[PDB]
Amino acid sequence: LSEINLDVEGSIVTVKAGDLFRQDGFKVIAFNEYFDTQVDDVIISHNSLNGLYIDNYLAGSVSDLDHRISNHQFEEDELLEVNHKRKVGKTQKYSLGTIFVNNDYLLTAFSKFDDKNRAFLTMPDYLAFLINFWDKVNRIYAQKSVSVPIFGSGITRIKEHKNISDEDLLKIMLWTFRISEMRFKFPAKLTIVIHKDKIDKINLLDIKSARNGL
Amino acid sequence: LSEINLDVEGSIVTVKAGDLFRQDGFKVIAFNEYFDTQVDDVIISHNSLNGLYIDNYLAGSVSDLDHRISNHQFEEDELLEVNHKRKVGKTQKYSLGTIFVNNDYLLTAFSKFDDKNRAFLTMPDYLAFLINFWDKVNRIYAQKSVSVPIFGSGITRIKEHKNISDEDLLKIMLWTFRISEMRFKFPAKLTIVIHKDKIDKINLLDI
């Protein structure tokens, strides 16, 4: 079984094996809190989806995107404090769930970076990113297709849940999307794209319950 | 029906109709971020579970409790800022999920208060409180009985979710608890208590 459609409180949500970059419509790439763009296996890694987007899929130079983000008008709440101590990498912190749209890609600030440029989140941070993100897309991209990976199944560490399964992350994503879409009467059309090789690990049948919040 | 036991990650979580104050073991009362104690229908309502506890069940004086909390030594993360502008009530703010023990009662910092002193939470606040709260009780009160109400099903307003239902709050509580106990060999023994007048609108059968 490689695809499932579920009714989540009135909206059809699709979970399917595939390649995110082959999806038509809006595609979500998970960046870090600084919206770093330097793929040198030091800040951003070449195996991440964040570095893979920049390496082979970004339109234009990395230097052009940096200036588009630097000269972008983020809400007063989406802008955080500036880490002047950051040695290697950008300095402006952004609040999780922040979205910078770039052609048909939604670059979202997902993971945090510690003093040792390690990608991490706490479970409260993870659930808070999801709720904020789901709010922004259901509000801004109502009725538009949005395709997302399994947030946090890559190198991002969820503190104290290092062994969390992609199947648990997937259920959480559906629980938090339900909480969000239930306040919107025309939410986004959500597709969760699972890497074709990882789909054999996940039992899509263990997830259907999350469409009702359990 | 009125009671169900759920096999959550191997642990049993009881959901029952009844009166929280009649439970054996630990009973959780939700306070605000300042741990205020002035039941006066402006900063703490006399109808809230917070008010009923202080008015009808607090063993000791409110002053004994305020001072005991003041002189209590929380963690460094649990102690946040100090609203000096605070026109009324305590000024020390605590991080949601902080617990102060008071006999067989766990007084936990749950709701936030605004300028008008409205009890409120963002949905990310609510989920963060639960994860931070569950982790504390699963670590400190492992194998001990902890009874709780449905957090958020009272005067507290979850922003953008003014009309969230008690059944939906119960569902959030149950899967945020699962995430928590996941990382504990011996979690706490959780009993979620619903008020008899609300088990009609909630179908524990569904769940």
Author numbering:
A (entry chain A): 65 to 278
B (entry chain B): 65 to 271
Q: Paper's wording?
A:
The ThsB genes encode Toll/interleukin-1 receptor (TIR) domain–containing proteins responsible for phage detection, while the ThsA gene encodes an Abi-triggering effector protein. Two ThsA effector variants have been reported: a silent information regulator (SIR2) and SMF/DprA-LOG (SLOG) domain–containing effector (ThsASIR2-SLOG) and a transmembrane (TM) and macro domain–containing effector protein (ThsATM-macro). Collectively, our biochemical and structural data demonstrate that the nucleotide signaling requirements for ThsASIR2-SLOG and ThsATM-macro effectors are distinct and suggest that ThsATM-macro effectors can trigger Abi via membrane perturbation by a mechanism that involves nucleotide-induced oligomerization of its macro domain.
We expressed and purified the macro domain of EcThsA (EcThsAMacro; residues 62 to 278). To define the structural basis for ADPR binding to EcThsAMacro, we crystallized and determined structures of this protein in ligand-free state and in complex with ADPR via soaking, at 2.7- and 2.1-Å resolution, respectively. EcThsAMacro exists as a stable dimer in solution, as characterized by size exclusion chromatography–coupled multiangle light scattering (SEC-MALS), and forms a symmetric u-shaped dimer in the asymmetric unit of the crystal. In both crystals, the symmetric u-shaped dimers stack against each other, forming open-ended higher-order oligomers. In EcThsAMacro, the dimer-dimer interfaces are predominantly composed of residues from the β6-β7 hairpin and the β3-α2, β8-α6, α5-β8, and α6-β9 loops, with a total buried surface area of 1060 Å2. In summary, our data support a mechanism where ThsATM-macro exists as an inactive dimer and subsequently oligomerizes within the membrane upon nucleotide binding. Our data also demonstrate that ThsA macro domains exist as stable dimers in solution and further oligomerize upon ADPR binding.
